[PDB]
UniProtKB/Swiss-Prot annotation:
Gene that encodes the chain: GPX4
Organism: Homo sapiens (Human)
Catalytic activity: a hydroperoxy polyunsaturated fatty acid + 2 glutathione = a hydroxy polyunsaturated fatty acid + glutathione disulfide + H2O; 2 glutathione + H2O2 = glutathione disulfide + 2 H2O; tert-butyl hydroperoxide + 2 glutathione = tert-butanol + glutathione disulfide + H2O; cumene hydroperoxide + 2 glutathione = 2-phenylpropan-2-ol + glutathione disulfide + H2O
Record-annotated active site: C48
Gene Ontology biological process terms from the UniProt entry: apoptotic process; arachidonate metabolic process; cerebellum development; chromatin organization; dendrite development; lipoxygenase pathway; long-chain fatty acid biosynthetic process; multicellular organism growth
UniProt cross-references to Pfam families, sorted A to Z: GSHPx (PF00255)
Family of this protein: Belongs to the glutathione peroxidase family.
UniProt disease annotation: Spondylometaphyseal dysplasia, Sedaghatian type: A form of spondylometaphyseal dysplasia, a group of short stature disorders distinguished by abnormalities in the vertebrae and the metaphyses of the tubular bones. SMDS is a neonatal lethal form characterized by severe metaphyseal chondrodysplasia with mild limb shortening, platyspondyly, cardiac conduction defects, and central nervous system abnormalities.
InterPro entries: Glutathione_peroxidase, GPX_AS, GPX_CS, Thioredoxin-like_sf
Name of the protein described by the UniProt record: Phospholipid hydroperoxide glutathione peroxidase GPX4
Effect of A95T: In a patient affected by cryptorchidism
Length: 172
């Protein structure tokens, strides 16, 4: 199986819960807090052709299903056509404009050596493995995380968020 020299290597992680991430305000978030919750993890951007549909539908799913245990982690990323160039503060007010109430994080990379460790891990999960590379291909890729922090499904850049709604009852 997985073999790591350093005890805290992402390759040997077994759950999203073992990771931490800086939030859009600059404060470290222990993702073990999502133990017990069903999560959508997505890479977002403000100047993308699917920005409007993804944000409005994510807000809609979170508003309707948060009482059911649904949580959403949005990671801004500037790597896909450079369509997230603003600062964290400007991105945060952009999301405020959609009445986002889920969890925004600080801008990261999702591909490369400096990609956030959580995303390195998600990309190698059997239900999160890509096509000839594992690398995230565009803005608004989405991962469904079950209550145990495991990746159970992935939805492509051009699958609007509402197509996740039919899979959520399986994990509540």
């Amino acid at each position: 199986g997985a073999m790591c020299a350093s005890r805290d290597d992402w390759r040997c992680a077994r759950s999203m819960h073992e990771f931490s991430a800086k939030d859009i305000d600059g404060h470290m978030v222990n993702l073990d807090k999502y133990r017990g919750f069903v999560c959508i993890v997505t890479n977002v951007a403000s100047q993308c052709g699917k920005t409007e549909v993804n944000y409005t539908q994510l807000v809609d799913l979170h508003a309707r299903y948060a009482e059911c245990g649904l949580r959403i982690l949005a990671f801004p990323c500037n790597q896909f056509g450079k369509q997230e160039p603003g600062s964290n503060e400007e991105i945060k007010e952009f999301a405020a404009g959609y009445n986002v109430k889920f969890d925004m994080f600080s801008k990261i990379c999702v591909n490369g050596d400096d990609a956030h460790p959580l995303w390195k891990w998600m990309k190698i999960q059997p239900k999160g493995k890509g096509i000839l590379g594992n690398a995230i291909k565009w803005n608004f890729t989405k991962f469904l995380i079950d209550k145990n922090g495991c990746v159970v499904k992935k939805y492509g850049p051009m699958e609007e968020p509402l197509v996740i709604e039919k899979d959520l009852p399986h994990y509540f």
